[PDB]
Design an enzyme around this catalytic site. Structure first.
Site, PDB file in Angstrom:
ATOM      1  N   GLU A  83      -6.937  -9.951   1.635  1.00 14.47           N
ATOM      2  CA  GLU A  83      -8.054  -9.251   1.037  1.00 14.47           C
ATOM      3  C   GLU A  83      -9.276 -10.153   1.165  1.00 14.47           C
ATOM      4  OE1 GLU A  83      -8.446  -6.181   0.691  1.00 14.47           O
ATOM      5  OE2 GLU A  83      -6.274  -5.819   0.641  1.00 14.47           O
ATOM      6  N   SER A 109      -5.034  -0.763  -6.893  1.00 14.09           N
ATOM      7  CA  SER A 109      -5.538  -1.336  -5.652  1.00 14.09           C
ATOM      8  C   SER A 109      -6.284  -2.646  -5.923  1.00 14.09           C
ATOM      9  CB  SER A 109      -6.434  -0.325  -4.928  1.00 14.09           C
ATOM     10  OG  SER A 109      -6.166  -0.338  -3.537  1.00 14.09           O
ATOM     11  N   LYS A 141      -0.356  -2.630   0.392  1.00 15.01           N
ATOM     12  CA  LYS A 141       0.049  -3.228  -0.879  1.00 15.01           C
ATOM     13  C   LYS A 141       1.459  -2.849  -1.242  1.00 15.01           C
ATOM     14  CE  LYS A 141      -4.772  -3.691  -1.971  1.00 15.01           C
ATOM     15  NZ  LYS A 141      -6.013  -3.073  -2.544  1.00 15.01           N
ATOM     16  N   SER A 162      -8.360   2.528   2.147  1.00 14.06           N
ATOM     17  CA  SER A 162      -9.700   2.807   2.632  1.00 14.06           C
ATOM     18  C   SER A 162     -10.188   1.596   3.401  1.00 14.06           C
ATOM     19  CB  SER A 162     -10.679   3.086   1.506  1.00 14.06           C
ATOM     20  OG  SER A 162     -11.973   2.912   2.010  1.00 14.06           O
ATOM     21  N   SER A 219      -5.462  -0.600   2.175  1.00 19.14           N
ATOM     22  CA  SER A 219      -4.713  -0.880   0.943  1.00 19.14           C
ATOM     23  C   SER A 219      -3.302  -0.284   0.949  1.00 19.14           C
ATOM     24  CB  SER A 219      -5.416  -0.365  -0.328  1.00 19.14           C
ATOM     25  OG  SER A 219      -6.828  -0.549  -0.381  1.00 19.14           O
TER      26      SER A 219
END
Length: 264
Positions: free
Chosen positions: A142, A106, A49, A213, A46
């Site tokens: 994602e 997130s 982002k 993560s 993440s």
């Protein structure tokens, strides 16, 4: 740079932590860098982002609105973690609301809407390129971009690359003045980042960061830091493990940060 024992302590941290660790610190006070494994590829998870919301921010600078452009959220858009978009299904979210949701929560649905809007992974990469980052690559969407499988260059960058790219975005002039501030505003509001880098810094220091993560215990965090009465720091901490199902290790990152800010 700093001292000969930071590297020894870092390698100690790494070995004792049961994984692989990458670090890059920039001190804007004197442009000293601390770098551990900072030329090896790590899976962003993440943390990527930041590049997404920022790629958009740049576009807003040649599209006097854009950031208020509304974007449809559909039932078919949903992926594992969407703390915000779940509240606007069959509704809309502006690009700002989406960036905001992606950075501070997130929100994986948000992230996909950001990738979508900028034309997919390759155009997020091309965005990093135009910033002088020839290492960052985003390849997937994602949720798959977090696989973080060892050896796999996909959706990786190097800690050096990302510390510098981040410095430019949040402190430098990769973005307009008001876009830069906005990116800083979002990072500083991140809700998730306390047990990570921030846990390794003087309590009173001010942090804007984005954790990450993923598979293989991949625990990551990228951060801009404003100590009271100092010049700011860029700190990038990537960590990953060998067991496919290892548990996250947010404290390894905090421990990393305590090591490379000792004496500051």
């Amino acid at each position: 740079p700093l001292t000969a024992d930071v590297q020894q302590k870092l390698a100690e941290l790494e070995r004792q932590s049961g994984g692989r660790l990458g670090v890059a610190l920039i001190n804007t006070a004197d442009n000293s860098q601390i770098l551990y494994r900072a030329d090896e590829r790590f899976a962003m998870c993440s943390t990527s982002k930041v590049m997404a919301a920022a790629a958009v921010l740049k576009k807003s600078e040649s599209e006097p609105n854009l950031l208020n452009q509304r974007v449809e959220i559909k039932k078919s858009d949903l992926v594992n973690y969407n703390p915000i978009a779940e509240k606007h299904v069959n509704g809309t979210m502006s690009l700002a609301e989406l960036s905001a949701a992606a950075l501070q929560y997130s929100d994986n649905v948000a992230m996909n809407k950001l990738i979508a809007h900028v034309g997919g992974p390759a155009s997020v990469t091309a965005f990093a390129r135009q910033l002088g980052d020839e290492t960052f690559r985003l390849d997937r969407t994602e949720p798959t971009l977090n696989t973080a499988i060892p050896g796999d260059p996909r959706d990786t960058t190097s800690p050096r690359a990302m510390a510098q790219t981040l410095r430019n975005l949040t402190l430098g002039k990769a973005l307009g003045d008001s876009q830069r501030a906005q990116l800083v505003t979002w990072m500083k509001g991140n809700t998730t980042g306390a047990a990570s880098i921030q846990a390794g810094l003087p309590a009173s220091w001010v942090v804007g960061d984005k954790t990450g993560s993923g598979g293989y215990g991949t625990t990551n965090d990228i951060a801009v830091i404003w100590p009271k009465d100092r010049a700011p720091l860029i700190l990038v901490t990537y960590f990953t493990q060998p067991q496919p199902k290892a548990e996250s290790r947010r404290d390894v990152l905090a421990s990393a940060a305590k090591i490379v800010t000792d004496g500051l």
